[PDB]
Design an enzyme around this catalytic site. Structure first.
Site, short mmCIF file in Angstrom:
data_model
loop_
_atom_site.label_atom_id
_atom_site.label_comp_id
_atom_site.label_asym_id
_atom_site.label_seq_id
_atom_site.Cartn_x
_atom_site.Cartn_y
_atom_site.Cartn_z
CB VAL B 53 7.15 -29.04 35.10
CG1 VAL B 53 7.69 -28.79 36.54
CG2 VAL B 53 7.67 -30.52 34.73
CG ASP B 54 2.09 -27.28 38.43
OD1 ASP B 54 3.12 -28.16 38.93
OD2 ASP B 54 0.96 -27.69 39.08
N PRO B 55 4.43 -24.43 38.34
CG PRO B 55 4.39 -22.28 38.08
CD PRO B 55 3.65 -23.21 37.63
#
Ligand SMILES: CCCCCCCCCCCCCCCCCC(=O)OC[C@H](COP(=O)([O-])OCC(O)COP(=O)([O-])OC[C@@H](COC(=O)CCCCCCCCCCCCCCCCC)OC(=O)CCCCCCCCCCCCCCCCC)OC(=O)CCCCCCCCCCCCCCCCC
Ligand SMILES: CCCCCCCCCCCCCCCCCC(=O)OC[C@H](COP(=O)([O-])OCC(O)COP(=O)([O-])OC[C@@H](COC(=O)CCCCCCCCCCCCCCCCC)OC(=O)CCCCCCCCCCCCCCCCC)OC(=O)CCCCCCCCCCCCCCCCC
Ligand SMILES: CCCCCCCCCCCCCCCCCC(=O)OC[C@H](COP(=O)([O-])OCC(O)COP(=O)([O-])OC[C@@H](COC(=O)CCCCCCCCCCCCCCCCC)OC(=O)CCCCCCCCCCCCCCCCC)OC(=O)CCCCCCCCCCCCCCCCC
Ligand SMILES: COC1=C(OC)C(=O)C(C/C=C(\C)CC/C=C(/C)CC/C=C(\C)CC/C=C(/C)CC/C=C(\C)CC/C=C(\C)CC/C=C(\C)CC/C=C(\C)CC/C=C(/C)CCC=C(C)C)=C(C)C1=O
Ligand SMILES: CCCCCCCCCCCCCCCCCC(=O)OC[C@H](COP(=O)([O-])OCC[N+](C)(C)C)OC(=O)CCCCCCCCCCCCCCCCC
Ligand SMILES: CCCCCCCCCCCCCCCCCC(=O)OC[C@H](COP(=O)([O-])OCC[N+](C)(C)C)OC(=O)CCCCCCCCCCCCCCCCC
Ligand SMILES: CCCCCCCCCCCCCCCCCC(=O)OC[C@H](COP(=O)(O)OCCN)OC(=O)CCCCCCCCCCCCCCCCC
Ligand SMILES: CCCCCCCCCCCCCCCCCC(=O)OC[C@H](COP(=O)(O)OCCN)OC(=O)CCCCCCCCCCCCCCCCC
Ligand SMILES: CCCCCCCCCCCCCCCCCC(=O)OC[C@H](COP(=O)(O)OCCN)OC(=O)CCCCCCCCCCCCCCCCC
Lengths: 186, 98, 96, 587, 62, 54, 108, 97, 52, 70
Positions: B53-55
């Site tokens: 889960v990237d930003p």
């Protein structure tokens, strides 16, 4: 997030900063913080205008959010000093301004919402307060004297001082019984 | 009726919503995302980077999380979330969570 | 500061002693000495703190007697004003 | 019984209502929620029944009453004023509407605020406001009128700012407080001028001797101003502030955070009508005034246009209703400028009844949506609030003035008597026409967006209101009492409006005397209209038809039914043409 | 002065419960006196004043 | 409504409570301020009734 | 802004009898609130003529010349009263010094 | 005082009464409203008695009783006003002294 | 007294929801610029009714 | 709103139900009605009314309006 946009004497620059970023001073944020906050604000505004709108089109909303996501993914990988990143910031701040609504829907869970602070909640200090002893028992001694302290009466709630001298029943027998008894003994 | 005696506030468990229900709903919503690979590896102790889960997908998920839980979360609160447990506790301790 | 006496002579203060029992036995080597008096106030059980607990008739009787005296005094004054020993009552009265 | 006709019981029942309200306010610890509710319900029902009995006698027959309670105050050396009430057609017209709307709002207010901690306070505040307004409209002299004027301002300051723990609502209440202080100043100065001129405060006498002072002037420091002009100026100023005309309207939209029963009473009759009442109370003065002749139609038309167009753009339900109220107040001002005093009463009754019902329906919708009043977060509410949907449809089609409804007739009557001799007539007429067509837009927007759009609200509302365990004969998203209140309010509104229409608009004129000697030829175009007038009204009819077609057949979004929508529009046009041909020429 | 002194000294003995207990302990004639006689004194003063302001001795009646 | 609880089962439904006045119900002080103010009211009312009305 | 360190506080005369109502429980005060409480009383001008331009010069001048405006308006309306034979602005003397409701009796 | 209205002839009022019209005339107060009649004071005594009994019941049951007390003082306090204003010579719309 | 003081949520005495207009002069300019449309529509309506 | 505790010492009116409200309602309603009846009975002495249908005011009658002799 406190929704005090209009109840403080703010200028437009402060309000625009608070709308785009969760602060009045975006210069103290990191690059990633700024990018993520701008992305969140843009998505929130697009949802507020293209899903909860007047004549909402879901297909157009999906197209716009896909384009915005592509643009912000490009934005994240850029460098802070680049002029292209500054142009992207300017473009999306302009987008936030162009969709600005003086009648924003404010979630009821926010601190400065329309229905916030409608009830005064009493803490345990007020709940346990009973000066006279009808609800909670009250000692005739009025307190428990702690050690290393003299025993003193509590300050009354009403310090009227409009009192008479001590009242006694009529025909009260108050002779010096002890003195008379001892004097009779000797 | 009130007992007509001094009764203090009751804090009970400190959760205004069921923590298990909040965690299950949040994990299902996370698994709904495209870049999440497998739902079976998600745990309360899992970090957002572990499950991929990237930003940007993080803010995408957290917007739908606040839509699903009938609340709204501040930027600082979301920035302070390191794992699924932090967000679950914050949501379950919210008075407005439905 | 207040300096009045609290052990009054007109009546005995309503109180109970079952509440707040003293220990008086089984002491350890570190705890403090027990308290002495422990008596607490006792309310009449028919007392409402949110209203006057007034059950008399004196105020109503005094106000009623004052109003009745006002009426009879006005009757006497009107009879005296018309130069009569008593009010002459007309056989018909009309709207003012 | 002749005793009832000779000695009114309205005074007794109104005193009972007032004393019960005051004693409930003082002795609120003895009466719980139920005790306060029951006591005030009994008092208000008795008052309503007595006033309903006397309504027919005062309206149709020529019955009116002048009641004096006693000598009250010394206001000059050797001068005393008494507490006088005048129960006549003008007073009863406002008082009956206020009392009926108040009875039904009172019954609805228990279902609203169902589990709030301060239901009793709201009920008693509503009772106090209604009592103040009824006392205001039943005034016999100018001092009682000033007392009612100051009372309605004070009690409305407490219905607003009901959430006294918030300073945000305190600001909104203080805005109205300041405007009311300005109103009080203007009214009290006008009363001072009247008393300095005629040395009396009785209204009836004032209405019969003011014509003797038409040719009089007063000396301001460098000006010689006609007496009628200055008195009318001050009266019109205070009326404009209370009735929220353009400019002095800004306090009214900010008054919307009050609970919705308070909004239903305040915006439908009562406060907003107070200024209108003043114009009806002192008709000869404004008949003899040049300032009124110039300022009533212009400001009324501007207010009507402004409120109508701003209302059609609102997204908050309460804001939409508030701006509709502003527009209708402007329309009432124009209707008074017409010079026909019956049309004013008809407009007042129709608008008040239907606006109050719409507020009630909107309040139930808002409660369901969990205090979110913007219909951008609503949609598909028909299956969760069906009674609200259907009753709201009826109330909006009547309120918007759509053709073949009761609200159509007041607009038509307004356009019958409009005077064309004004210098600024083009602007006035354009504003009136643009404000007349705005009702369809906001009515359609409100109804369609709340009930028959896509689901734009939060998932929690829909999903929590639809669990399987909730399926029962007791299932409901509202209260039964709310439904009964709205139903009976609509029925009583229809009955009263039909009775008034029969009394005023029949060939046989049956209305009692309005105590006015200024008569114009407006009824002629109602009784014997000519061809060009009918064509002129047909123009506006077709404009409304075009607007309805626009709001029905315009596609602002992509859909699977777009092509079929265009096909259906074409089919409707062709069918209408052929149907007209068949109905007009062959068979 | 007699009425106000007796009123003050009969109703200034303590709190509401203390006053109720004292009155209950009082015998019936004492309660009757402490109620009635201040009212008697004050009302008689008012009656004397009212007789002072009214001329009812005038002999032109009838 | 779906899960309404009656007053008996509701533990946070209040009955009339609270002290009307800051004065102590079991005060042992010979306070006379209240008596003086009641004298003021009662004598003013009696003077109105017995001297001024008729 | 940092909380104030030096500001004007409340002060009491020597041997003052303290107020002990409602149990005599006094809380600690807020420095900003106390500073605001005592700021206006101790505020003063810095140089001569600073007042005239402080705020709005035109508004301050208008406020300064208010009494003259009132006197002139009263003079104009006295002109209006003189020709209409209205009540003038004079100390009327029509009771010859007899007071409003005054007992005028003699002894002997 | 004067008549203040234009004169009318006796023949005209004879014609008016022949046409079926009736001359307006003030009506005497009914017994309930008359403050000097016997039914007025019978009602007052009934009010006082029921007020005393209901005050006793309210004291027994715990209901407020100050309103029943206001009915007891209300009777003699309103007899003064009703009879006092009937004695005055001022003229309202009702009747001419 | 330019602020509504409160121990919870103190506020400014006047709210400004239309803060995108920075001051009153630009507000007046914007209001007139946008009300020209209503002026034109009113003119068209009156022209129609005056012709017919 | 969710119910929250109210301190016992406060004489405030949040969520109050009196179990004896029926008798209190009775004993507040009926004396109020009697007081209002007395007020109305007093006020009907000073109440005016126009003449009924079919009646006319004789201009020379004492009840007719009057002028002043100077
Ligand atoms: C406390 C804290 C206060 C804090 C205040 C802060 C400010 C803000 C406001 C806060 C408000 C809330 C706080 C208080 C709440 C509270 O305690 O509530 C419970 C409290 C009740 O307490 P409770 O526990 O039941 O105890 C009561 C006793 O048990 C009753 O036992 P009882 O049967 O013996 O009754 C005794 C009663 C028996 O007597 C009566 O009931 C009749 C009183 C007659 C008064 C007038 C007498 C004549 C002198 C005046 C001049 C008259 C001229 C002619 C007028 C015509 O006599 C009195 O109480 C004496 C009072 C008057 C003394 C005289 C001087 C004043 C005269 C004017 C009084 C006005 C009262 C308030 C009116 C408010 C509305 C206008 O109050 C109420 O529930 C209601 C109070 C008001 C009742 C009024 C009833 C009607 C009276 C009408 C009389 C006239 C009739 C005229 C007929 C028509 C004529 C034409
Ligand atoms: C030979 C005969 C010669 C004489 C012939 C007749 C001549 C008559 C002339 C006229 C005489 C008039 C009266 C003269 C003064 C003396 C009367 C007197 O001493 O009576 C008491 C005396 C006995 O009194 P008590 O039983 O000892 O009780 C009094 C205690 O001191 C205290 O009792 P407690 O402390 O145990 O209980 C407290 C209770 C006791 O009651 C009293 O103390 C009554 C006086 C209360 C004064 C203040 C009340 C509130 C006034 C409000 C005014 C309006 C404000 C707003 C205006 C707008 O107070 C209440 O219940 C308070 C009333 C409720 C107030 C609620 C207010 C709510 C807010 C209203 C305003 C809201 C908007 C703002 O009466 C008698 O002994 C009667 C004797 C009858 C003898 C018959 C023959 C044998
Ligand atoms: C005798 C007693 C009669 C009682 C009548 C009671 C009401 C009957 C109608 C019930 C439904 C009312 C819906 C209101 C809301 C609405 O329009 O939503 C938009 C809603 C959009 O939803 P949608 O279905 O997705 O629309 C997409 C397509 O346009 C969908 O296209 P489509 O293929 O479904 O529609 C084709 C066809 C479908 O056919 C039907 O639905 C047949 C059943 C309804 C026939 C109604 C009479 C039609 C002839 C006139 O409808 C038409 O061709 C309608 C043409 C006639 C209306 C426009 C021109 C009217 C000029 C004269 C007006 C005079 C009366 C004024 C009002 C009087 C008091 C109510 O559009 C409709 O509901 C259209 C169908 C209903 C048309 C008739 C409406 C009559 C009421 C007056 C017009 C509305 C004024 C604003 C009211 C706002 C609420 C207070
Ligand atoms: C749309 O509103 C507006 C609002 O909302 C009501 C607003 O809030 C605001 C915002 C206002 C503020 C922030 C504060 C400003 C304070 C104010 C008081 C401004 C209020 C402004 C208005 C109410 C708008 C009115 C102004 C105009 C220009 C309206 C334009 C109307 C027309 C063009 C109608 C067309 C008229 C024609 C063609 C006349 C031609 C004549 C003939 C053909 C002959 C026939 C006529 C006659 C024989 C008699 C008529 C003759 C004359 C000379 C009268 C004509 C004069 C007129 C003014 C028509 C603005 C700016 C606004 O703008
Ligand atoms: C000589 C004639 C001159 C005519 C001048 C022009 C007059 C136009 C009609 C009056 C003004 C209407 C302004 C808009 C009011 C509603 C605003 C609103 O909320 O809209 C959203 C409503 C409801 O939609 P919604 O709110 O669901 O969302 C739609 C999406 N948005 C928000 C972007 C609009 O939609 C409409 O109002 C649709 C547009 C209406 C267009 C009307 C065109 C009329 C054409 C002229 C007809 C002339 C006939 C002959 C007349 C003879 C007599 C003069
Ligand atoms: C002689 C004739 C006099 C005729 C006029 C009499 C006027 C009496 C006014 C009412 C006095 C008591 C008010 C008590 C309010 C209260 O308890 O509020 C609870 C709440 C607080 O509730 P709370 O729970 O904190 O306290 C309840 C417990 N007590 C009161 C004992 C402490 O107060 C407020 O909200 C403050 C504002 C109150 C505003 C009241 C509305 C206006 C009242 C107007 C009355 C007249 C209207 C009709 C016109 C009549 C014209 C003649
Ligand atoms: C201050 C200004 C004083 C101006 C002079 C006195 C008033 C006018 C006297 C002449 C009579 C007259 O014209 O009266 C009508 C006028 C209202 O009509 P108006 O608004 O002028 O109509 C526009 C025409 N196209 O009537 C008025 O304007 C009357 C205004 C009275 C109130 C003025 C303000 C309060 C008192 C100061
Ligand atoms: C001559 C005096 C006339 C006074 C009435 C006319 C002027 C009204 C001004 C209204 C105003 O400025 O209101 C501001 C504030 C409330 O405004 P707002 O913040 O919109 O409140 C809604 C809350 N959501 O309300 C207030 O600040 C109320 C106090 C206004 C004081 C105005 C003083 C004269 C100004 C000219
Ligand atoms: C329009 C729709 C209105 C619907 C109202 C429904 C509620 C209602 O009023 O029900 C009647 C009520 C029932 O009372 P209940 O539920 O038995 O009380 C429980 C508390 N012990 O019963 C009553 O209200 C009557 C009970 C006695 C009320 C007081 C009687 C003395 C005072 C009378 C004044 C007139």
């Amino acid at each position: 997030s406190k929704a005090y946009y209009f109840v403080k004497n703010f200028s437009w620059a402060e309000v625009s900063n608070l709308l785009c970023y969760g602060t009045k001073y975006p210069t103290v944020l990191n690059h990633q913080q700024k990018v993520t906050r701008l992305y969140r604000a843009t998505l929130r505004r697009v949802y507020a205008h293209q899903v909860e709108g007047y004549k909402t089109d879901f297909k157009q909303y999906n197209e716009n959010i896909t384009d915005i996501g592509k643009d912000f993914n490009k934005m994240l990988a850029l460098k802070p000093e680049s002029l292209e990143l500054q142009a992207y910031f300017k473009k999306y701040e302009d987008l936030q301004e162009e969709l600005f609504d003086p009648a924003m829907i404010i979630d009821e869970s926010r601190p400065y919402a329309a229905s916030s602070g409608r009830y005064y909640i009493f803490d345990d200090y007020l709940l346990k307060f009973d000066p006279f002893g009808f609800y909670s028992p009250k000692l005739l001694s009025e307190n428990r004297p702690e050690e290393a302290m003299p025993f003193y009466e509590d300050y009354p709630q009403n310090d009227s001082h409009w009192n008479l001298w001590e009242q006694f029943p009529e025909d009260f027998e108050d002779s010096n019984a002890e003195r008379e008894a001892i004097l009779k003994s000797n | 009726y009130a007992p007509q005696k001094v009764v203090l506030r009751n804090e009970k468990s400190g959760y205004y919503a069921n923590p298990d229900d909040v965690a299950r709903r949040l994990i299902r919503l996370i698994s709904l995302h495209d870049k999440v690979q497998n739902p079976s590896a998600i745990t309360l102790k899992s970090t957002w980077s572990e499950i991929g889960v990237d930003p940007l997908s993080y803010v995408e998920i957290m917007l739908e999380a606040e839509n699903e839980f009938y609340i709204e979360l501040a930027d600082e609160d979301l920035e302070r979330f390191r794992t699924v447990e932090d967000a679950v506790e914050f949501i379950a301790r919210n008075f407005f969570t439905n | 500061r207040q300096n009045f006496a609290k052990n009054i002579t007109t009546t005995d203060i309503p109180k109970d002693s079952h509440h707040f029992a003293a220990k008086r036995s089984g002491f350890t080597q570190t705890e403090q000495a027990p308290f002495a008096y422990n008596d607490v106030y006792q309310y009449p059980k028919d007392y409402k703190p949110w209203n006057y607990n007034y059950k008399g008739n004196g105020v109503l009787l005094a106000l009623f007697l004052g109003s009745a005296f006002s009426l009879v005094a006005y009757e006497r004054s009107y009879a005296s004003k018309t130069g009569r020993y008593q009010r002459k009552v007309q056989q018909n009265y009309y709207q003012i | 019984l002749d005793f009832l006709n000779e000695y009114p019981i309205i005074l007794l029942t109104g005193l009972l209502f007032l004393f019960t309200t005051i004693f409930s306010l003082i002795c609120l610890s003895y009466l719980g929620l139920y005790g306060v509710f029951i006591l005030n319900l009994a008092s208000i029902l008795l008052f309503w029944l007595s006033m309903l009995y006397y309504f027919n006698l005062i309206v149709s027959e020529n019955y009116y009453y002048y009641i004096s309670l006693g000598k009250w105050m010394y206001l000059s050396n050797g001068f005393r004023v008494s507490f006088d009430l005048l129960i006549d057609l003008t007073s009863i017209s406002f008082s009956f509407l206020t009392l009926t709307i108040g009875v039904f709002v009172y019954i609805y207010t228990f279902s609203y605020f169902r589990y709030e901690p301060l239901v009793e306070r709201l009920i008693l505040f509503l009772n106090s406001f209604m009592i103040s307004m009824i006392l205001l409209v039943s005034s016999g002299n100018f001092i009682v009128l000033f007392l009612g004027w100051e009372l309605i301002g004070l009690t409305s300051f407490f219905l607003i700012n009901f959430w006294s723990t918030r300073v945000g609502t305190l600001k909104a209440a203080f805005k109205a407080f300041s405007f009311n202080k300005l109103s009080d100043l203007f009214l009290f100065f006008a009363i001072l001028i009247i008393f300095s001129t005629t040395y009396n405060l009785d209204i009836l006498s004032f209405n019969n001797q003011i014509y003797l002072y038409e040719s009089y002037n007063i000396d301001m420091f460098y000006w010689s101003i006609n007496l009628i002009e200055i008195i009318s100026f001050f009266f019109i100023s205070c009326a404009f502030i209370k009735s929220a005309q353009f400019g002095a309207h800004i306090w009214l939209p900010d008054s919307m955070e009050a609970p919705v029963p308070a909004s239903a009473l305040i915006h439908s009759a009562t406060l907003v009508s107070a200024g209108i009442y003043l114009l009806l109370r002192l008709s000869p003065l404004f008949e003899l005034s040049k300032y009124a002749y110039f300022i009533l139609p212009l400001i009324g038309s501007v207010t009507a246009f402004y409120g109508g167009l701003v209302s059609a753009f609102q997204s908050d339900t309460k804001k939409t209703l508030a701006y509709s109220t502003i527009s209708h107040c402007g329309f009432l001002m124009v209707s008074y400028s017409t010079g026909v005093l019956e049309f004013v009463i008809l407009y007042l009754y129709v608008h008040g009844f239907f606006k109050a019902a719409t507020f009630l329906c909107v309040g139930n919708v808002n409660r369901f949506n969990r205090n979110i009043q913007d219909f951008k977060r609503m949609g598909g509410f028909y299956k969760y609030l069906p009674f609200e949907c259907l009753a709201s449809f009826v109330c909006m089609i009547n309120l918007s003035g759509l053709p073949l409804t009761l609200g159509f007739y007041i607009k038509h009557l307004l356009f019958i008597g409009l005077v064309e001799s004004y210098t600024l007539y083009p602007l006035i007429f354009s504003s009136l026409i643009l404000g007349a067509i705005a009702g369809v837009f906001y009515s359609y927007r409100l109804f369609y967006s709340i009930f028959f759009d896509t689901k734009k609200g939060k998932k929690a509302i829909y999903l929590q209101a639809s669990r399987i365990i909730l399926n029962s004969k007791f299932y409901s998203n509202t209260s039964l009492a709310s439904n009964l209140s709205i139903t009976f309010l609509v029925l009583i509104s229809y009955t009263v409006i039909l009775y008034l229409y029969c009394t005023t608009l029949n060939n046989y004129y049956s209305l009692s005397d309005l105590k006015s000697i200024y008569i114009n030829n407006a009824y002629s175009y109602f009784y014997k209209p000519d061809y060009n007038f009918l064509n002129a009204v047909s123009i506006l009819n077709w404009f409304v038809i075009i607007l309805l077609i626009s709001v029905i057949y315009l596609n602002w979004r992509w859909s699977y039914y777009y092509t079929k929508s265009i096909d259906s529009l074409s089919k409707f046009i062709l069918f209408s043409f052929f149907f007209f041909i068949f109905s007009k020429y062959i068979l | 002065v007699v009425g106000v002194l007796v009123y003050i000294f009969f109703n200034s003995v303590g709190g509401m419960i203390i006053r109720s207990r004292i009155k209950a302990a009082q015998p019936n004639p004492n309660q009757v006196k402490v109620l009635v006689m201040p009212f008697v004194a004050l009302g008689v003063s008012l009656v004397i004043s009212r007789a002072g302001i009214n001329g009812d001795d005038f002999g032109y009646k009838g | 409504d779906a899960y309404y609880h009656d007053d008996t089962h509701e533990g946070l439904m209040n009955e009339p409570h609270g002290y009307l006045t800051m004065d102590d119900p079991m005060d042992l002080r010979p306070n006379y301020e209240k008596s003086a103010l009641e004298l003021l009211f009662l004598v003013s009312g009696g003077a109105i009734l017995a001297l001024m009305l008729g | 802004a940092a909380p104030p360190a030096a500001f004007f506080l409340y002060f009491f005369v020597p041997d003052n009898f303290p107020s002990a109502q409602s149990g005599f429980r006094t809380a600690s005060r807020n420095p900003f609130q106390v500073q605001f409480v005592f700021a206006y009383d101790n505020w003063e001008y810095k140089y001569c003529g600073q007042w005239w331009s402080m705020g709005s010069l035109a508004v301050n001048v208008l406020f300064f010349v208010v009494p003259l405006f009132l006197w002139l308006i009263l003079q104009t309306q006295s002109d209006q009263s003189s020709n209409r034979d209205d009540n003038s602005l004079t100390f009327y003397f029509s009771n010859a010094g007899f007071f409003f409701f005054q007992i005028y009796t003699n002894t002997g | 005082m004067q008549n203040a209205y234009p004169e009318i002839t006796d023949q005209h009022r004879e014609f008016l009464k022949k046409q079926g019209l009736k001359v307006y005339e003030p009506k005497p107060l009914p017994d309930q409203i008359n403050p000097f009649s016997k039914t007025y004071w019978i009602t007052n005594a009934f009010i006082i008695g029921v007020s005393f009994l209901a005050r006793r019941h309210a004291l027994k049951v715990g209901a407020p009783r100050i309103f029943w007390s206001g009915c007891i003082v209300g009777v003699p306090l309103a007899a003064i006003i009703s009879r006092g204003k009937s004695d005055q010579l001022d003229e309202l719309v009702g009747a001419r002294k | 007294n330019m602020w509504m003081y409160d121990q919870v949520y103190p506020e400014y005495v006047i709210s400004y929801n239309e803060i995108h207009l920075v001051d009153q002069w630009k507000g007046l300019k914007e209001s007139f610029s946008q009300s020209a449309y209503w002026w034109a529509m009113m003119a068209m309506v009156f022209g129609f009714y005056f012709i017919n | 709103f969710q119910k929250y505790p109210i301190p016992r010492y406060l004489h405030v009116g949040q969520w109050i139900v009196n179990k004896n409200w029926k008798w209190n309602t009775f004993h507040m309603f009926f004396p109020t009605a009697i007081l209002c009846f007395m007020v109305w009975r007093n006020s009907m002495i000073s109440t005016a009314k126009p003449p009924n249908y079919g009646e006319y005011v004789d201009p020379q009658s004492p009840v007719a309006p009057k002028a002043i002799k100077y």
